[PDB]
Design a binder for this molecule. Sequence first.
Ligand SMILES: *[C@@H]1O[C@H](CO)[C@@H](O[C@@H]2O[C@H](CO)[C@@H](O[C@@H]3O[C@H](CO)[C@@H](O)[C@H](O)[C@@H]3O)[C@H](O)[C@H]2NC(C)=O)[C@H](O)[C@H]1NC(C)=O
Ligand SMILES: *[C@@H]1O[C@H](CO)[C@@H](O[C@@H]2O[C@H](CO)[C@@H](O[C@@H]3O[C@H](CO)[C@@H](O)[C@H](O)[C@@H]3O)[C@H](O)[C@H]2NC(C)=O)[C@H](O)[C@H]1NC(C)=O
Ligand SMILES: *[C@@H]1O[C@H](CO)[C@@H](O)[C@H](O)[C@H]1NC(C)=O
Ligand SMILES: *[C@@H]1O[C@H](CO)[C@@H](O)[C@H](O)[C@H]1NC(C)=O
Ligand SMILES: *[C@@H]1O[C@H](CO)[C@@H](O)[C@H](O)[C@H]1NC(C)=O
Lengths: 47, 342
Amino acid sequence: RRYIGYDALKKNNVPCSRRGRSYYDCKKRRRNNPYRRGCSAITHCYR
Amino acid sequence: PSLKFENPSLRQAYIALQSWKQAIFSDPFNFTANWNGSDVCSYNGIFCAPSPSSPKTRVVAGIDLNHADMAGYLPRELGLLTDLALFHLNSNRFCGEVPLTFKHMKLLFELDLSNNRFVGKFPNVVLSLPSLKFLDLRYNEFEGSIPSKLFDKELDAIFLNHNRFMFGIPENMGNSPVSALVLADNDLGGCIPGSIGLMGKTLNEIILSNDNLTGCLPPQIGNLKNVTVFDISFNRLSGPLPSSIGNMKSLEQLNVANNRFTGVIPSSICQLSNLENFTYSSNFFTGDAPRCVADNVVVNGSMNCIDGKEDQRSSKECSSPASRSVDCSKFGCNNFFSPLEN
Ligand SMILES: *[C@@H]1O[C@H](CO)[C@@H](O[C@@H]2O[C@H](CO)[C@@H](O[C@@H]3O[C@H](CO)[C@@H](O)[C@H](O)[C@@H]3O)[C@H](O)[C@H]2NC(C)=O)[C@H](O)[C@H]1NC(C)=O
Ligand SMILES: *[C@@H]1O[C@H](CO)[C@@H](O[C@@H]2O[C@H](CO)[C@@H](O[C@@H]3O[C@H](CO)[C@@H](O)[C@H](O)[C@@H]3O)[C@H](O)[C@H]2NC(C)=O)[C@H](O)[C@H]1NC(C)=O
Ligand SMILES: *[C@@H]1O[C@H](CO)[C@@H](O)[C@H](O)[C@H]1NC(C)=O
Ligand SMILES: *[C@@H]1O[C@H](CO)[C@@H](O)[C@H](O)[C@H]1NC(C)=O
Ligand SMILES: *[C@@H]1O[C@H](CO)[C@@H](O)[C@H](O)[C@H]1NC(C)=O
């Protein structure tokens, strides 16, 4: 029900609402190391 | 000065950030207020992480200033942030051109420069970025044509909508393994490049709406079996919908509105079980879609020359020079390489 393509049409919304977190890695923050990503396709791991 | 630094990387980062603090002219949400002292990691919007080259040395891994209404430009000194992996700059007021010095950001993975005041030609600097997989340049004022090398590069997502781009989509679009591609709200002339058929294994969402696209919809879109969103609205596309649309089994959002499509709605649209929202409105269709599975699936069939439905296009406005079927080869693009279904 939420798609990155249609969200891209809105200028304000971001994929990852957590500040400093990688878009690919919106999870509950413990350490926030962007170097460990674990995802390669936003459409499969969006928000 | 008298400031001691933990490692040489944060010292250059302090050089880069204070230089870029001088480049910032307006900070509504007082982000640069914290940019004092030698503890670079405490700066608002600056995010440190253990370096992969040496985990003991902490380095500046990310910069995230999303939704800050900050105004300024990107100075040359930002290229010293070689350890950067993410760079978030949505909803800022940074103007000018992307600096050539980003070539040193070898580890940069995702780049979001959306909703800004960047101008000039398309920044070819992002093409040199080795680790880049996420490129976001939406809502800016980048000029010129989209370079063909962009679609040769291995990227995950490319967003270029509502920018000052021109001169059509590069014909090598099919070479990009992108899962999400949005090139909408642009004055791009030409047809849908037929290279989309090559994108079947990787593409998941594509939106080409509100572009200046004229021509026929290529039938090799059926190879796009794992694409969820397919939006071609607000274009000058003429022709029939190919029966191959039913092969896009994962299609959830299908928007074909605001075009010049002739003929009937094929019966293969019946095969789409994941389809939840379908829109084929303000088109010159003469045949309606069947009853197959249409509650909880919204369909809008407005402004269509079908005799059965209600709220249809005017009789005058129908049987018009666009309502007439088109040769589909009278256009100068080569979308398709095999004759149409008929
Ligand atoms: C970010 O920090 C700056 C200061 O570091 C804040 O600016 C301050 O904003 C308040 C607004 O309530 C100003 O108070 C006003 O002063 C004028 C006198 O010129 C008075 O007539 C108003 O009735 C009001 O009391 C304050 O002077 C100003 N300080 C400055 C400019 O040094 C700013 O508000 C901070 N950002 C946010 C989002 O709060
Ligand atoms: C099913 O999908 C269709 C197509 O995407 C949805 O219709 C679209 O709805 C959006 C807003 O939700 C419309 O955007 C607006 O368009 C006006 C046009 O002037 C513009 O001024 C606004 O700023 C805004 O961008 C969009 O035009 C519209 N498209 C069509 C072809 O009607 C529909 O809402 C979806 N239905 C459900 C239940 O999700
Ligand atoms: C559409 O494209 C044609 C040629 O590409 C151009 O002359 C025209 O101004 C464009 N129209 C709109 C409304 O963008
Ligand atoms: C692609 O579509 C098939 C159709 O059943 C589905 O099983 C699969 O999970 C989808 N995604 C991928 C990555 O194959
Ligand atoms: C189709 O979209 C138009 C857009 O204005 C709207 O007026 C109309 O009610 C819609 N039809 C249906 C059946 O939702």
